[PDB]
Amino acid sequence: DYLYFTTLAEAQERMYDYLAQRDNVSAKELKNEATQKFYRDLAAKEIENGGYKITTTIDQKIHSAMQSAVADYGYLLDDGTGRVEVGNVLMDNQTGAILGFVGGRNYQENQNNHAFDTKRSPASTTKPLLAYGIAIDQGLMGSETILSNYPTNFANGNPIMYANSKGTGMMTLGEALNYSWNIPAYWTYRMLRENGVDVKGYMEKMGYEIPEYGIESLPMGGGIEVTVAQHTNGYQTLANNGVYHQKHVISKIEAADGRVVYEYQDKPVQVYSKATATIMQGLLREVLSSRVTTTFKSNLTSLNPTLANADWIGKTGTTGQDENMWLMLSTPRLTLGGWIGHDDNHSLSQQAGYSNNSNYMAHLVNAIQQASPSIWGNERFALDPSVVKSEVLKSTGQKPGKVSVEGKEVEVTGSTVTSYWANKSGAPATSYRFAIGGSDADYQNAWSSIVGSL
């Protein structure tokens, strides 16, 4: 099944490296196609014939429960666009160990591995990692920072859309994330580009391969295609207080006589500050609780109300013609990545991600807990002590003070809120351009509203 061939493939690659080094083959000799073919064949025969012991990270009872879950409840994905395919990876947040996965609906009917082999755009699930997370890490925004959702066009002249909406006005990062509005994400990434932020440094530390970082739609998964396993590794980094661990299924290969062919080496990397990661956890908690883009919390509360009270955080994504739906879920202990789509890339139904995948993943999470009752954990995500708390205006997301609006030095006061920052000084004083993004026209309209309220 999917586990046998995934494990065999990874074991073969590790045996290939071992045999090449053992036989003292140069990096140069390894470039020779005939020599590579020989060493791949020799690696295969060594596993096939050799009596090696392959130790995996797979929790057999959990992985078996995930297979029974997709057998029993996979039909909940079928939405009247034909048989819907599925991939899921369950990952330990502290180690990057893969405890279990779903390769697809039924290996016997379709062998394609939707957990490790198929690459699709992660759509709006890019936003927390590539846009908001990095902006917070760089001290360019906090939890109650304001972004423009005013209408704006891509560089090709097309309006940036959210279903049938061309946009609204100013909104908090929280509203931007809960709805997954697109314009605020676009302005956030544009701000990173304008400031020359090394985005590629963050994404490559987490093992992402992105060919062009200049794509305006990058935060909406434009110019990005990822496996479920890889993308699960990104959400592992946010959930593990910003510390990446490389995903792995193989922990060790030993000869019969106990000689170590290969052993996984942990190389932890602080990709985001603890402040940034713990701020993002708080925002992604509200994405699921708000139930705007996913019914997941309603589905899970009904199936398993005790498990629904674990500290769930998550994010959804939908490609533009509903070809791909994503739901990424974490507790402090585990991350579960979920993709659905069609092997030939044709459209799912409009609600496939909102309802069907949410319901299926609620069943999958319940099946994992039933197989291993403590595995999700009862720990809460919590703000790191290094987080800076700023009292800011609800209206501007910046500290109270004086601003020049149309000549007249205006005293900006009103309702305040605590904003969480990952810098030293926290939020600055209100400036005229108080938000991420927006045109001179947008700001005229915004300030009109704010002055009216004083």
Ligand X SMILES: *C(=O)[C@@H](NC(=O)[C@@H](Cc1ccccc1)NC(=O)CCCCCN=[N+]=[N-])[C@@H](C)O
Binding residues for Mg(2+): 207, 209
Q: Answer left, alpha or beta for residue 355, where phi above 0 means left and psi between -120 and 50 means alpha.
A: alpha
Going across the sheet that includes 53-56, the strands are: 53-56, 250-254, 260-263
Task: Sketch the per residue contact string, 318 through 357, with ligand X: x for CB under 6 A, - otherwise.
Answer: xxx--xx---------------------------------
- Of 339, 308, 309, 454, give the one whose Cα is nearest residue 393: 454
Q: Does 291 bind Cl ion (CB under 5 A)?
A: yes
Q: Does 178 bind ligand X (CB under 6 A)?
A: no
Which residue, 106 or 347, is less far from ligand X as judged by CB? 347
Give the number of residues written for the chain. Answer: 454
Q: Does 14 bind Cl ion (CB under 5 A)?
A: no
Q: Does 60 bind Cl ion (CB under 5 A)?
A: yes
Q: Which stretch binds ligand X (CB under 6 A): 63-71, 203-211, 214-222, 439-447?
A: 214-222
Determine contact, residues 137/423, Cβ cutoff 8 Å.
no
Q: Which stretch binds ligand X (CB under 6 A): 71-79, 220-228, 271-279, 399-407?
A: 220-228
Based on its alpha-carbon atoms, the radius of gyration of the chain, rounded to whole angstroms, reads 24
Which of 100, 317, 397, 437 is in the footprint of ligand X by CB under 6 A?
317
Torsion angles phi and psi, residue 330, rounded to 5: -140, 145
Which of 56, 180, 304, 358 is in the footprint of ligand X by CB under 6 A?
180
Q: Virtual CA dihedral for 289, 290, 292, 296, nearest 10 degrees?
A: 10
Determine contact, residues 47/8, Cβ cutoff 8 Å.
yes
Q: Which two tokens stand for residue 278?
A: 């713990």
Q: Does 124 bind ligand X (CB under 6 A)?
A: yes
H-helix or E-strand spanning residue 65: helix 60-73
Q: Which of residues 365-384 bind Cl ion (CB under 5 A)?
A: 379-380, 382-383
What's the rounded Cα separation, in Å, for the pair 299 and 146?
Answer: 31
Determine contact, residues 158/222, Cβ cutoff 8 Å.
no
Smallest gap from Cβ 351 to ligand X, in A, equals 13
Among ligand X, Cl ion, none, the one that 33 touches (CB under a kind-dependent 5 to 8 A) is: none
CA distances from 179 to 294, 317, 416, 443 (A): 10, 11, 23, 22
Q: Does 230 bind Cl ion (CB under 5 A)?
A: yes
Contacts to ligand X by CB under 6 A? 121, 123-124, 160-162, 180, 182, 217, 220-222, 317-320, 323-324
Contacts to Cl ion by CB under 5 A? 1-3, 5-6, 10, 59-60, 113, 116, 120-121, 124, 152-153, 175, 178, 180, 191, 199-200, 208-209, 213-216, 226-227, 229-230, 247-250, 255-257, 273-274, 289, 291, 293, 295, 297-298, 316, 318, 342-344, 379-380, 382-383, 388-391, 423-425, 436, 439-441
